[PDB]
Amino acid sequence: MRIILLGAPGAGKGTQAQFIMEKYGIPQISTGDMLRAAVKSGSELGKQAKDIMDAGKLVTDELVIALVKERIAQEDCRNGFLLDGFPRTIPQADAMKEAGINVDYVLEFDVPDELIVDRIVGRRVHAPSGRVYHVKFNPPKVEGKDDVTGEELTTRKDDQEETVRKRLVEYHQMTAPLIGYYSKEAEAGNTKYAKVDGTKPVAEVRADLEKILG
């Protein structure tokens, strides 16, 4: 199974990708997690992307496309994969299309801009792994600790109010047009398209997705 998750920053994509990975056994391919992993490892990619990300802007299409193409050529993606935060622009979607890469499902996460800024305030992450929590809506079992390692949680650098509002403007400008892009592909029968109400609690969005994916 091949799946694309669409939605504004903070709409709940990474949270729901982990259930899909658990249930259907396909790797979560999150370009944000890979880029942050590149920073964590000190790679040349990490050196090129760090300042762009901190500014809340999008990394060059050509770089992220090469990143994804190498990632999905790996053996754990042979039987499917979930794309989380990619494609992010029309050129990234056309690059995948011209490469012959079709996906089975496109899932849009619908969340108003107003909830997102308040939501991202309480976002806490196990920075090594990228596991994501919320202090109110999806807390860890132990306040301030990762459920798996017991390591202290942190707050992403780009999750401050000002950066989050920069990211939302980039989303509506560059990314929101992918809604019509993959709706057109679905009408041509090249994928299934579905939209979920991301304002609901995590358990209800999860249930909604299970009905769609089976």
Ligand X SMILES: Nc1ncnc2c1ncn2[C@@H]1O[C@H](COP(=O)(O)O)[C@@H](O)[C@H]1O
Ligand Y SMILES: Nc1ncnc2c1ncn2[C@@H]1O[C@H](COP(=O)(O)OP(=O)(O)OP(=O)(O)O)[C@@H](O)[C@H]1O
Which residue positions form the known binding site? 10-15, 31, 36, 57-59, 85-88, 92, 119, 123, 132-133, 156, 167, 200
Q: Find the DSSP H helices in the chain.
A: 13-24, 31-41, 44-54, 61-72, 90-98, 113-121, 161-170, 178-187, 202-213
Contacted by 59, from ligand Y, Mg ion, ligand X, none: CB < 5 to 8 Å by type: ligand X
- Position 17 contacts ligand X (CB under 6 A): no
Overall size of the chain counted in residues: 214
The least distance separating ligand X from the CB of residue 189, rounded to whole angstroms, comes to: 26
The least distance separating ligand X from the CB of residue 31, rounded to whole angstroms, comes to: 3
Known catalytic residue at 145: no
How far is the CA of 167 from the CAs of 2, 92, 142, in angstroms?
Answer: 26, 18, 30
Which is the catalytic residue, given 2, 71, 123, 131? Answer: 123
Find out whether 161 and 117 touch, Cβ atoms under 8 Å.
yes
Residues in the annotated binding site for AMP: 31, 36, 57-59, 85-88, 92, 156, 167
DSSP string, 156-178: -GGGSHHHHHHHHHHIIIIITTH
CA max distance for the chain: 48
- Position 10 contacts Mg ion (CB under 5 A): no
Pick from 14, 56, 140, 198: which binds Mg ion (CB under 5 A)? 14
Radius of gyration of the chain (CA): 16
| Residue number, 186 or 202, with CB nearest to Mg ion | 202
Known catalytic residue at 2: no
| Separation CA 154–CA 58 (nearest Å) | 23
Known catalytic residue at 124: no
Q: Which residues are known catalytic residues?
A: 13, 88, 123, 156, 167
| Residue ranges that bind ligand X, judged by CB under 6 A | 9, 31-32, 35, 52-53, 56-59, 64, 85-86, 88, 92, 167
